[PDB]
Design a protein around this ligand. Structure first.
Ligand SMILES: O=C(O)CCC(=O)C(=O)O
Ligand SMILES: [Mn+2]
Length: 209
């Protein structure tokens, strides 16, 4: 089951080292700008989610009381996907045939401090179409799958799979890896500042406030 679930997971994963060090550095400077702007109060209420070791910045579309009861906000509640995201990031993904033109209407920047993390979850299937596309910046890390170990540590202490995520790499989740298994990130795998950009398409018939 474990080696067999790893196979099934790997089946729904795709990765490309798509961004040079130089491109990563250009995008990383822009990510810093977004942090500065948020701090100057320039963004709408629901654009910035601040947690202790994790800040999240929602563009294009955002989502919210009850587990798996995520609801989209009136678009207009979150800020526009900025121009540098479109041109530095989404354009390159469109160019290299990772996703089609017009797919993306949601870009979320997660900014991680050292020892930051994200607990076990599935990207909510009722809000987002598949595939989920993520691009990494500032440093290398790892994305874990099958995150039972975070909650039941006597029985188990390793994930079903651990996937390295390099600076400048693109990770694309679908089928089994996006739908039938959790993913998470461990504090121990974020040794220095990491940021990731998550590019998604919301469902038309996604539930809404
Ligand atoms: O930080 C990452 O690479 C993944 C985070 C994540 O799974 C999410 O925000 O949906
Ligand atoms: Mn996720």
């Amino acid at each position: 089951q474990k080696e067999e679930e790893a196979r099934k997971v790997k089946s729904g994963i795709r990765q490309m080292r798509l961004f040079s060090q130089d491109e990563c550095a250009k995008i990383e400077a822009r990510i810093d700008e977004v942090v500065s702007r948020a701090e100057k109060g320039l963004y709408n209420e629901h654009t910035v989610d601040r947690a202790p070791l994790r800040n999240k910045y929602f563009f294009g579309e955002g989502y919210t009381r009850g587990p798996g009861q995520e609801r989209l906000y009136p678009p207009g509640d979150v800020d526009e996907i900025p121009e540098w995201v479109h041109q530095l990031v989404i354009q390159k993904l469109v160019e290299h045939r990772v996703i089609p033109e017009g797919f993306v209407n949601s870009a979320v920047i997660n900014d991680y401090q050292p020892g930051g993390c994200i607990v076990s979850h599935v990207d909510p299937i009722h809000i987002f179409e598949r595939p989920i596309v993520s691009v990494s910046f500032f440093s290398d890390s790892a994305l874990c799958f099958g995150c039972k170990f975070q909650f039941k540590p006597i029985r188990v202490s390793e994930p079903v799979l651990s996937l390295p995520v390099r600076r400048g790499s693109v990770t694309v989740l679908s089928g089994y890896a996006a739908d039938e298994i959790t993913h998470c990130i461990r504090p121990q795998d974020i040794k220095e500042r990491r940021a990731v950009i998550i590019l998604r398409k919301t469902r038309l018939d996604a539930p809404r406030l």
